[PDB]
Amino acid sequence: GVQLQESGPGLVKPSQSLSLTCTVTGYSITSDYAWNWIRQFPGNKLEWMGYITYSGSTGYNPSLKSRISITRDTSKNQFFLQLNSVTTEDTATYYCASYDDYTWFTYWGQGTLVTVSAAKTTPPSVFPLAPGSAAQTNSMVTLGCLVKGYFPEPVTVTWNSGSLSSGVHTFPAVLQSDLYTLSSSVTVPSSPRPSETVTCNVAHPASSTKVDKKIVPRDC
């Protein structure tokens, strides 16, 4: 099938230039269709930025035109986005998509988050969350991991390397003081934990951080 994948910096300093790449596999970008760049702002607002057609002609949204550029590399089957003089208002999720409005052909990328800020990249601190004044007499036991003080978004959280997927709740990060705090919880029957091991795996690409934290019973 056809696949579009965005790649680029997750953090950009204000007034600087943003550069993103969309790698297309499964179809040639010189054959047909328009290859677009669309961004989504926090709050659900979507904005079409521009496109480069299969023939190489470009079209830009009037509101961006003075600082936007879209080019391509027909040998690598990639098209790019360059946005100059970015400000905090350019912070958003960037998507590349291909379609034509009158045919069945439509594909969207996974999207990539771009944060514009002067804050510095900061690795998260991962703290294990285990039951307190209780030994879990119930049938289910809820555990969790607290991912605190990182920047920028996003972080990835899995449990037991992804094998534990049911009963998991990972909450959206909340910003405070230029730092993010996120949490995740997992509920297992009293049978497993503390018998079987439960570990949360968190990854922070921006800081190339990767940490596994085992949840162990408290003594105190």
Partner: protein, 219 residues
């Protein structure tokens, strides 16, 4: 710029019932070749937008027969004859007749489900954190409905508003419930000058608030 207006803003519908979304454009979306370029997208929680309908009424591949698009000129409607759990998310209207392409504001579809009480769990700060000079108390309120809920923190019986971070997950497509995380962050020094920490939840499923707490005595 052509302005796209979607109504309603949100739609809470029960499984099996029909749903309808309206979209209006300030200018006719009829093109010079006689076609009207109006599409409908669906963005499920945590996913990229996905086109469902193009050219007003044509269904994209894989899209269920339950969806139907109609309209003409400046008024268009998306109808779902029977809502299923997987339909939740944000629906967008989008025109490609005039330059530049513009999207409607979006319509959020929520699954109206039966009331469900939250399961509350409270967690004291980990030893590892206390070493850093900080202290975060966490409270989880999982799988509840409706989304409306009020959480209050009490330190030694006194209510605390400062330093509380709340976060909700989107509606779960598997059970249509919501979950919430509430974190109270204090300095190690303030955490140690108090004994009882309480997470209190007020929800429509219980006449009295649900309470979970711990005291720095039984750990």
């Amino acid at each position: 710029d052509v302005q796209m207006t979607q109504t309603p803003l949100t739609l809470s519908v029960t499984i099996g019932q029909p749903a309808s979304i309206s979209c209006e454009s300030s200018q006719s979306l009829l093109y010079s070749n006689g076609k009207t370029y109006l599409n409908w997208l669906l963005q499920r929680p945590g996913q990229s937008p996905k086109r469902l309908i193009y050219l007003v009424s044509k269904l994209d591949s894989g899209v269920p027969d339950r969806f139907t698009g109609s309209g003409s000129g400046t008024d268009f409607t998306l109808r779902i004859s029977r809502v299923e759990a997987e339909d939740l998310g944000v629906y967008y209207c989008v025109q490609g007749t005039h330059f530049p392409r513009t999207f409607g504001g979006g319509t959020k579809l929520e699954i109206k489900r039966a009331d469900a009480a939250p399961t509350v769990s409270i967690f004291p700060p980990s030893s590892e954190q206390l070493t850093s000079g900080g202290a975060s108390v966490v409270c989880f309120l999982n799988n509840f409905y409706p989304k409306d809920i009020n959480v209050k923190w009490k330190i030694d019986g006194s209510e605390r508003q400062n330093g509380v971070l709340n976060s909700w997950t989107d509606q779960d497509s598997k059970d249509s419930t919501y979950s919430m995380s509430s974190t109270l962050t204090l300095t190690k020094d303030e955490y140690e000058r108090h004994n009882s920490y309480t997470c209190e939840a007020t929800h429509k499923t219980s006449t009295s608030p649900i309470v979970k707490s711990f005291n720095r005595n039984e750990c």
